[PDB]
Design a protein around this ligand. Structure first.
Ligand SMILES: OC[C@H]1O[C@H](O[C@@H]2[C@@H](O)[C@@H](O)O[C@H](CO)[C@H]2O)[C@H](O)[C@@H](O)[C@@H]1O
Ligand SMILES: OC[C@H]1O[C@H](O[C@@H]2[C@@H](O)[C@@H](O)O[C@H](CO)[C@H]2O)[C@H](O)[C@@H](O)[C@@H]1O
Ligand SMILES: OC[C@H]1O[C@H](O[C@@H]2[C@@H](O)[C@H](O)O[C@H](CO)[C@H]2O)[C@H](O)[C@@H](O)[C@@H]1O
Ligand code: CA
Length: 559
């Protein structure tokens, strides 16, 4: 029960509770693979008419999201049945999936949408959303079945089920200017700004074009939809990579955007444009119960403080889900669900104001991270990451804790703890970068544990990791590394109440030589009640070869 508390239930297609006459994939950790990229590292392949996967509802549902893979450059249907009776068709498509690179150019993952000579397809899964005209009770058999006229083949990865309430009306037509078939979002906002009795705008159920960046100014503005399944803001879908959404000027600090969805038209990553909400320096803004897809990011804060992002769904983006940078402090990032981000799902990048401080990243779920980490913290002071669920990273840790500057002006970690408290990390880690001349070499890449503690070129200190379960990480549970030649001494690094279950290589790795010119870790870390269970090779690697690093076994360690 770690992570976000969402109204939808997620059921893996391959669950043993699901009858099927299709083909259940054996798991692997390979990017560019229909198993490796699936939630749970497996899917059920339906490849003939009449092949099905049968789900059983554990909670009532009238609405469904099917994560699936179909052929490149295709659209079509797959059928849904309730208790053996056909009830509709999902619109399945690869419009937003299939991003191309090569095994040695994973730095391009997400950027390049066109197939080409010698190029491998990655980011193979996408989603289909469907609402049915009845609430089906728990115990209903919901069958996904490939009938005549459906797509030639489909990998079924998981099903979201949800009991969606009826749409919520305009809270008060005399205070919220309604968008309508003949009144645009921009026109409603102009009416709002020019009449001080208005609190904001209401966007009814429907599909509403957002073909521009919509600027909020004048004063604090409320933007209220009917619910994310009902109010859909849609980037022009015959265009691609249009920078649309909202941009909140300082005059509109204190605004609220809630209860709606935003459907972008990005088909690859672009660096600069592409955040659904822009709000450089924004303060006291609330973004609540919105569902956003196919943007580069939901939000990328820049000295943005005292904001609240709550109850949101961030799916299938081309870079970070939410990042808060360059002084962003005292933000509440609470109870958000991310799946399929294109870079760090939830991130905090501290830079020069000296540190990002006082942020609370709580009750967060980040899964199917298509590049980089589920959670990432780059420097900062007095920031909390609490009750996290991360799973199924393609290329990188579940949690990155790093004092590398990336060339920006930053002091690294500060004098108050950065705390990871309560986290479950399932099948996290992966391959990235290169390992030429590396120690402990198993392939052409650097190899990443579920949690990466990386001392870079800035101070690495005051890190507390506690109450973490790490299940079946690709390679390692905890991976400690110091950048040479800087050799920053890690101080006050403590690990408490951690279970590392079935890591394929080591429970703990102290990186001895990541690549040519690099050396072992500097400083130390303490371990209290850290259990390593059934490691593939050994509980800990690198201790005897890291003479500048002290492992302190306080108590309760079985290694
Ligand atoms: O603060 C660093 C820069 O952040 C943003 O651009 C990011 C870019 O550097 C790269 O990391 O990709 C992400 C996602 O597309 C970009 O958001 C700002 O746009 C840029 O002005 C900053 O210098
Ligand atoms: O050195 C410049 C690059 O630094 C970072 O990436 C490092 C990478 O090059 C390799 O050496 O591995 C280390 C980790 O062991 C990486 O941190 C930046 O991420 C990259 O953008 C720079 O080009
Ligand atoms: O061509 C636009 C769009 O069509 C499909 O998605 C539908 C979406 O437009 C509408 O708002 O909701 C429908 C029911 O949930 C969706 O099926 C395609 O799936 C999508 O790729 C495409 O952009
Ligand atoms: Ca699955």
């Amino acid at each position: 029960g770690r992570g976000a508390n969402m109204p939808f239930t997620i059921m893996e297609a391959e669950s043993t509770s699901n009858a099927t006459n299709g083909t259940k994939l054996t798991p692997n950790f390979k990017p560019g693979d229909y198993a490796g990229e699936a939630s749970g590292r497996s899917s059920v392949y339906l490849d003939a008419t009449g092949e099905y996967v049968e789900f059983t509802l554990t909670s009532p549902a009238n609405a469904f999201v099917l994560r699936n893979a179909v052929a490149e450059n295709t659209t079509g249907t797959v059928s849904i049945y309730a208790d053996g009776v056909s009830k509709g068709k999902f619109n399945v498509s690869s419009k937003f999936s299939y991003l191309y690179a090569t095994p040695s150019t994973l730095g391009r993952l997400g950027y390049d949408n066109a197939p080409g000579a010698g190029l491998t397809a990655y980011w193979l899964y996408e989603d289909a959303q469907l609402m049915l005209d009845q609430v089906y009770p728990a115990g209903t058999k919901i069958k996904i079945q490939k009938d005549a006229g459906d797509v030639s083949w489909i990998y079924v990865d998981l099903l979201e089920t949800e009991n969606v309430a009826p749409p919520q009306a305009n809270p008060d037509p005399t205070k919220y200017v309604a968008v309508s078939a003949s009144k645009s979002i921009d026109q409603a906002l102009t009416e709002f700004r020019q009449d001080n009795t208005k609190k904001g705008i209401y966007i009814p159920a429907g599909e509403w074009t957002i073909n521009s960046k919509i600027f909020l100014y004048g004063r604090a503005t409320e933007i209220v939809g009917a619910g994310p399944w009902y109010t859909k803001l849609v980037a022009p879908q015959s265009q691609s990579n249009t920078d649309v959404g909202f941009n909140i000027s300082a005059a509109a600090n204190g605004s609220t955007i809630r209860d709606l969805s935003a459907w972008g038209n990005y088909i690859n990553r672009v660096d600069g444009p592409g955040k659904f909400i822009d709000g450089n320096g924004m303060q006291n803004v609330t973004v609540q119960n919105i569902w956003v897809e196919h943007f580069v990011c939901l939000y990328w804060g820049v000295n943005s403080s005292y904001n609240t992002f709550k109850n949101n769904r961030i799916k299938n983006t081309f870079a970070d889900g939410i990042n808060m940078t360059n002084g962003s402090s005292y933000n509440v990032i609470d109870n958000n669900y991310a799946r399929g981000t294109g870079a760090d799902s939830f991130a905090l990048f501290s830079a020069t104001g000296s540190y990002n401080v006082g942020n609370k990243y709580t009750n967060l779920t980040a899964t199917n991270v298509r590049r980089a980490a589920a959670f990432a913290v780059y420097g900062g002071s007095d920031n909390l990451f609490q009750n996290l669920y991360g799973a199924d990273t393609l290329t990188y840790p579940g949690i990155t804790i790093s004092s590398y500057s990336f060339g920006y002006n930053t002091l690294g970690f500060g004098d108050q703890d950065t705390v990871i408290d309560g986290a479950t990390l399932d099948r996290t880690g992966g391959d990235f970068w290169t390992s030429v001349g590396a120690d402990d070499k198993i392939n052409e890449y650097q190899n990443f544990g579920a949690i990466w503690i990386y001392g870079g070129d800035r101070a690495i200190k005051n890190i507390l990791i506690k109450n973490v379960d790490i299940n079946n990480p690709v390679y390692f549970g905890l991976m400690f590394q110091s950048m040479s030649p800087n050799n920053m001494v890690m101080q006050n690094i403590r690990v408490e109440n951690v279970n590392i279950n079935n890591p394929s290589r080591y429970g703990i790795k102290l990186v001895v030589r990541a690549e040519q010119g690099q050396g072992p870790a500097y400083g130390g870390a303490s371990f209290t009640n850290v259990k390593v269970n059934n490691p593939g090779i050994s509980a800990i690697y690198g201790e005897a070869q890291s003479p500048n690093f002290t492992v302190t076994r306080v108590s309760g360690n079985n290694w």
